[PDB]
Amino acid sequence: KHKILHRLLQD
Amino acid sequence: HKILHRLLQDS
Amino acid sequence: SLALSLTADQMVSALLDAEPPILYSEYRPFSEASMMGLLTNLADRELVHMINWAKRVPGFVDLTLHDQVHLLECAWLEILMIGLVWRSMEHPGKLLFAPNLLLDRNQGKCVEGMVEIFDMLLATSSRFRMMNLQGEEFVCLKSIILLNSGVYTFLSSTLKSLEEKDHIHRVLDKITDTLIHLMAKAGLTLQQQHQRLAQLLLILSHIRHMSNKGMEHLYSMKCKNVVPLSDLLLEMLDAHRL
Amino acid sequence: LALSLTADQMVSALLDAEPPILYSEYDPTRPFSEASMMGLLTNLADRELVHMINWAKRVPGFVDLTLHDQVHLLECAWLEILMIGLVWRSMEHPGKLLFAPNLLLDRNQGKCVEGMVEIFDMLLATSSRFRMMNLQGEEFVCLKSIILLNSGVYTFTLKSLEEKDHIHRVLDKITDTLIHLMAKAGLTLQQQHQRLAQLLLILSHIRHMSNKGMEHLYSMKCKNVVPLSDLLLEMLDAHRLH
Ligand SMILES: C[C@]12CC[C@@H]3c4ccc(O)cc4CC[C@H]3[C@@H]1CC[C@@]2(O)/C=C/c1ccccc1C(F)(F)F
Ligand SMILES: C[C@]12CC[C@@H]3c4ccc(O)cc4CC[C@H]3[C@@H]1CC[C@@]2(O)/C=C/c1ccccc1C(F)(F)F
DSSP for D52-72? HHHHHTTSTTGGGS-HHHHHH
Distance CA C147, CA D117 (A): 24
β-pairing, C101-104 with D96-100? unpaired
β-pairing, D103-106 with D96-100? antiparallel
| Among the listed residues C214, C174, B8, C117, the one whose alpha carbon sits nearest the alpha carbon of residue D197 | C174
Does C235 contact chain D (CB < 8 Å)?
no
| Among the listed residues D93, D37, D198, D238, the one whose alpha carbon sits nearest the alpha carbon of residue C166 | D198
Angle, helices D189-222/D67-90, rounded to nearest 10 degrees: 100
The contacts of residue D127 (CB under 8 Å, 6+ apart) are: D86, D87, D88, D90, D91, D93, D97
Beta strand residue intervals within chain C, DSSP E:
94-98, 101-104
CB count within 10 Å of CB C170 equals: 14
Q: Which atom of ligand 1 is nearest to the CA of C80?
A: 11
In short, whether C221's Cβ falls inside 6 Å of ligand 1 is: yes
Q: Report phi then psi at C96, rounded to 5.
A: -95, 85
Q: Which ligand is nearest to the CA of C42?
A: 1
Does A2 contact chain D (CB < 8 Å)?
no
- Residue B1 exposed, middle or buried by CB count within 10 Å (0-12, 13-18, 19+): middle
User: Coil, strand or helix: which one is D111?
Assistant: coil
Query: Considering only alpha carbons, which residue of chain C is nearest residue B1?
Result: C235
Distance CA C196, CA D179 (A): 13
Q: What's C62's DSSP letter?
A: G
Q: What's C153's DSSP letter?
A: G
- Which residues in B lie closer than 8 A to residue C48 (C-beta atoms)? 7
Q: How far is the CA of D64 from the centre of ligand 2 (A)?
A: 31
| Among the listed residues C147, C204, C151, C197, the one whose alpha carbon sits nearest the alpha carbon of residue C172 | C147
CB contact under 8 A, D203 and C206: no
CB contact under 8 A, A4 and D67: no
Q: Domain D1-242 carries which CATH code?
A: 1.10.565.10
CB count within 10 Å of CB C191 equals: 12
C residues 66-125 near B, CB within 8 Å?
68-69, 72-73
Annotated binding-site residue numbers of D for 17beta-estradiol: 48, 89, 216
8 Å CB contact between C149 and C208: yes
Q: Which atom of ligand 1 is nearest to the CA of C109?
A: 26
The contacts of residue D16 (CB under 8 Å, 6+ apart) are: D58
- The alpha-helical segments, DSSP class H, found in D91-136 are 116-132
Distance CA C53, CA C24 (A): 18
Distance CA D131, CA D93 (A): 10
Annotated binding-site residue numbers of D: 48, 89, 216
User: Coil, strand or helix: which one is D78?
Assistant: helix
